[PDB]
Design a protein around this ligand. Structure first.
Ligand SMILES: [Hg+2]
Length: 156
């Protein structure tokens, strides 16, 4: 498992200057009590504002995404897991479609998202953390791979 503070620090280097990121979090996902204050401390360690929009059903996904954009002006979407609601194609395809229309990058929990249009995911290696990047989409959305990570970055 790549930890949230590890993902946010990777996000800071992949999208330099990012200031506001939005998280769609399934309220039913386990470890909610551990993950949400985890996100806020990663936010304080990075200087990136992390707005968390929780969803309990598929119906809540669209209003919560739109609220993140209209009221919080997030510049990217961050999805941490997909064990329940966020693993259903209806929620994934919406989040990917509309983030793509808004020109914002999506940091995703598995390669399935990158095959559908998301920008970046990650996996823990013997060597630490390796990046997986959809190049053509990530390039177009302002993602830059630091040379310190060019070696340890696969391109879907
Ligand atoms: Hg994207």
């Amino acid at each position: 498992e790549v930890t949230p503070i590890q993902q946010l620090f990777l996000i800071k280097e992949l999208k330099p200057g990012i200031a506001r990121i939005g998280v769609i979090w399934d309220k039913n996902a386990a470890n909610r009590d551990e993950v949400l204050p985890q996100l806020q401390r990663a936010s304080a360690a990075t200087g990136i504002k992390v707005v968390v929009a929780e969803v309990a059903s598929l119906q809540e996904v669209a209003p919560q995404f739109r609220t993140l954009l209209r009221d919080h002006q997030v510049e990217a979407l961050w999805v941490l897991e997909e064990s329940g609601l966020l693993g259903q194609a209806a929620a994934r395809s919406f989040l990917i479609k509309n983030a793509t229309q808004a020109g914002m990058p999506v940091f995703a929990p598995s390669e399935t998202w990158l095959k559908e249009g998301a920008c970046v995911t990650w996996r823990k290696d013997a060597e630490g953390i390796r990046l997986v990047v959809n190049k053509a989409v990530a390039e177009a959305m302002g993602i830059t791979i630091p040379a310190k990570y060019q070696d340890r970055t696969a391109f879907l």
